[PDB]
Amino acid sequence: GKCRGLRTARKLRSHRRDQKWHDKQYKKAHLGTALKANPFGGASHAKGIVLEKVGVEAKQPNSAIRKCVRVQLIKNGKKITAFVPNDGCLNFIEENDEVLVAGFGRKGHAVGDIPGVRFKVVKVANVSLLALYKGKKERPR
Amino acid sequence: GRMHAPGKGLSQSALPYRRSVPTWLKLTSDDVKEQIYKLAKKGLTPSQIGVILRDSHGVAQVRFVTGNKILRILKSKGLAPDLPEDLYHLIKKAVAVRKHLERNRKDKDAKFRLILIESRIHRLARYYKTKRVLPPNWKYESSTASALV
Amino acid sequence: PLAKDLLHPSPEEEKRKHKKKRLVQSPNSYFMDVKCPGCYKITTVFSHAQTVVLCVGCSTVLCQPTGGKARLTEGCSFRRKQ
Amino acid sequence: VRMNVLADALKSINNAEKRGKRQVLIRPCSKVIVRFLTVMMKHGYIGEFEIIDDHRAGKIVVNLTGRLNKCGVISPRFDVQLKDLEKWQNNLLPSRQFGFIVLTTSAGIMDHEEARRKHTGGKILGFFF
RNA sequence: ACCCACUCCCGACCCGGGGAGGUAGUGACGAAAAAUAACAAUACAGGACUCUUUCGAGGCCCUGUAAUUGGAAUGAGUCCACUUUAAAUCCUUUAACGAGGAUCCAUUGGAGGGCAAGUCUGGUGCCAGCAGCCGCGGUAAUUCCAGCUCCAAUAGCGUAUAUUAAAGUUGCUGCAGUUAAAAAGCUCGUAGUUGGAUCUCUCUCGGCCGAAGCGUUUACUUUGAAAAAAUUAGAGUGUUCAAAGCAGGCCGCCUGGAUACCGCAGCUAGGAAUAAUGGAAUAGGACCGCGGUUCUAUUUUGUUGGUUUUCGGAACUGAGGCCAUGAUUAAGAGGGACGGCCGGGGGCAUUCGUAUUGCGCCGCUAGAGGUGAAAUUCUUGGACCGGCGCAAGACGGACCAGAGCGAAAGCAUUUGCCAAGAAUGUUUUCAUUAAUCAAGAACGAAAGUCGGAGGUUCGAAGACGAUCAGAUACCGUCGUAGUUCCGACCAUAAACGAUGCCGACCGGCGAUGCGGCGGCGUUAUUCCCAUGACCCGCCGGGCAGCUUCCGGGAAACCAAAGUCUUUGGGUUCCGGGGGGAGUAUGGUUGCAAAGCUGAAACUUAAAGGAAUUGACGGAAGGGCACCACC
């Protein structure tokens, strides 16, 4: 059992503090290795330059080509792969243009049948992909 | 349970409820005191004195006849031993085990039992130093402890 | 089962128990006055004696220590006290 | 070794009452045990008890009337102020209609309602309901 | 951008200055209020607390695509004049214009489940895509792309990320640790944590009537001081309501601008349970009067002087009176002594037993090993077998058990010596000395390392022979290190009861091991008692077993793995989805092998536990049919 003494506060507090490091989420948040490894570096979004269009194969139970883009982030020169969500939206992206990319929704984890992809394109050339998809706006010329 | 064994024995003395002197016992308190003095002069520890008085002279409990315990009587008369008899016997047992281990170096069981004995010695000596029964500088060293025996 | 109760007698259930586990603990031993046929005086001996006691006027072995209750010699008449 | 003789006494009373026994033996007895038992009995939760006096440490034979659901000890004896009493009652008691928290205060050993009447706090010994 | 008009500040100053500050601008950070319609008349529909007749009669209350009809209402907007203000703007106020498809048009996400709301239609056809998760899509897709319809919030709604609750998935409240992740191999041990019972009228007085403590300390609890505002809580107050604000109210007067909380530490005063702590044990102990010493702020209205020969204070000691003189009990806590036993517990020495291998001699003889068959191997230099001896090195059968001992690892021929130990017995002794344990330490199977001795057997490696598609393996014949002992190292095991230790409580039964107690009777000591072996019980530890709706648990199952949401006896170690991985790296230990400590990036929706039903089994046991056999 655990100690129950009026003078065990140091023991209890210290044991809790040592045992909190075996919490995966607590350790990931407080160790600093995950923040260093994060390409966004703690940001919610990041602007990058599209290097090439890459087609990502959906995982084995499904079958599709997930149209992604490799982008290089302006802030730190890191190369990530970002999903271009809707259909025909890869046609809205050219090569060597600026795109705003956000997380994919799992806080750094891959989503669905898209291996190794944890980012999605939000804007292209300072125009949202939703506006171009719905026809509300057109990419600049 | 035992301090140094997995034993959970229950065997011990069971004092009777009555604290009075037995009706059969005709020795005066001073008579028991002189018998205690004689037995101490013979060279006996208070436990041995109590055992002899119980077995032969019918003194069921010295504390109930004389109103005092055997060690207190020995101290008050001035013939109590230098160090308490439990610690003395623990040191004697340690000395015996060390003498055996000197000529039997492959006896790991003897070494383990010596460790237990010296731990008991140290605990008792610390308790006695707390009660000012032993001088605060007293220490059990296994180099000339046979002289203490 | 309804402890310390006079309605159901239990001398027999109390002296059967362990001496320490009784309602009020009490020894299972006793002191006994011993006459030796060759002697002429009382000797009060503990039942569970650990000493080879001798007659106070002679050199006769009154009793010998055993694992429990001491073993008395033949002919010595022993009677418990109290 | 045994600490907290009151914990042993309360656990024994609880175990005996859960088996439906009419009496329970408690050893060793102590002043705190006797006061806690008196508090329990004044509220009709145990009944009469007898203190067997042996010359070392007494025993208690407690007559059980099956009105007791749980008698428990709170270790350590946390200091309780009059403000913390409501939170302790919410934590320990099964209802605001019945059940008692026993405290040792400078005014004696008493339930929580009596401690509120005398406007005193103290240290929590245990509870019963 | 405008201004010192407000709030305040500065200067020699009523006067000047202030990008402090105020005002406006941009502003879906965010917060409050709040439009996008309301109503009536006919036609339906619904019910009636209407006739009643479920045919029907029905402007009683209602509902709708009427995209029917009709008027009433209003502010978004435009604009005028005030008002606002330093000047303006914005609100507020007034007038004019301002609504019918009131086109003066509400959006953002969804419609398989979680989760509210379409297996409607068209397209696509594992593509395109959706999908937080499960999943959808491979020719009716309830899920993609659309149309329609529906629903959720609504001037807002979706997405990413940080964080809180959910998470009793960090557990103080309040989690787990036999098998799901997990208790150190095992003991000792300092700190830490936790600790059995017990003790119920004293200083100057003009109110027994102002006061002192000079005596024994704290924790706790209650109280009283002191403690910025703003924020939070909270009293009052119709901002048109509300967020707010600190205002305001009445016919010049009345009134507010409260109050609470403010943890810990510090200060203060009552209480005295609980918890710690203290005195008297060589009495250099309490009270009491005596023997002895001092300028002792006066013990000289007189010029002090040597007439302060002295109450009051700091000593050292003696004789006394006096304490009811002063030691709680003796834990079903612990240590120690003592008694008779007990055990494959340990060390040293000693002895015996066959077996195996080898050697010598004798006899007979051509085979003997070995195998699922063989072959490799030995063999007329006489093998195998039988007999008599000798030697060596191992090991200690049967007895031998759900029996014993040990901290665990582990421990079995006889005898002796050496020290140790549990339990029991105890009207012995000490008297809290205890429990658990960071640091530290002892021991720790097997294998392994170094040195020495030995080397029977078995035998990693290796050689050969087989089996096989292949075998590098299983099987066979040999065989090195090793296996044995001595001295150093290593410190790991499915080191397991996969189950920490200490304490209490909660069923039954029969056994068994040790000790003790009691008792018909049977045997041996060839005689009295005793002592053994039995028999029948009881008590205490111990290894276990059976049983049981104690209770628990996911169950298996467990009298503990119970006394757990009715949750708190004490304490140590330790787990937090599966992998990466007990890996990398650093430190440390080791001669080495390696041991201890021990990540992260990344990857993933399960991995796992227990039990159930099937299927299968180169698992066992049955049954049947001349499509089985005899």
Side-chain angles (χ1 to χ4, degrees), chain D residues 81-96:
Chain D
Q81 315 206 352
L82 272 176
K83 337 166 280 153
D84 312 356
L85 203 39
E86 208 50 71
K87 294 171 200 76
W88 273 107
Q89 291 162 233
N90 294 342
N91 289 346
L92 293 181
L93 298 183
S95 177
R96 306 178 27 98

Side-chain angles (χ1 to χ4, degrees), chain A residues 58-64 66 113:
Chain A
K59 290 226 259 262
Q60 180 191 111
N62 274 353
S63 217
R66 303 311 173 189
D113 56 20

Side-chain angles (χ1 to χ4, degrees), chain A residues 45-111:
Chain A
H45 299 244
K47 273 168 195 191
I49 286 295
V50 171
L51 300 178
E52 69 154 328
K53 304 196 181 183
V54 44
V56 174
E57 298 230 278
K59 290 226 259 262
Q60 180 191 111
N62 274 353
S63 217
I65 297 298
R66 303 311 173 189
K67 275 89 198 189
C68 303
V69 285
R70 273 213 84 80
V71 348
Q72 210 179 11
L73 308 178
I74 294 153
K75 53 191 304 188
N76 46 24
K78 291 189 175 162
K79 322 172 109 94
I80 63 130
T81 314
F83 188 47
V84 194
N86 279 346
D87 90 1
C89 290
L90 192 78
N91 311 316
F92 290 130
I93 300 180
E94 313 298 328
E95 253 205 67
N96 263 235
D97 63 81
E98 175 173 331
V99 289
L100 177 83
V101 292
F104 216 167
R106 304 261 317 258
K107 283 86 212 147
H109 189 283
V111 193

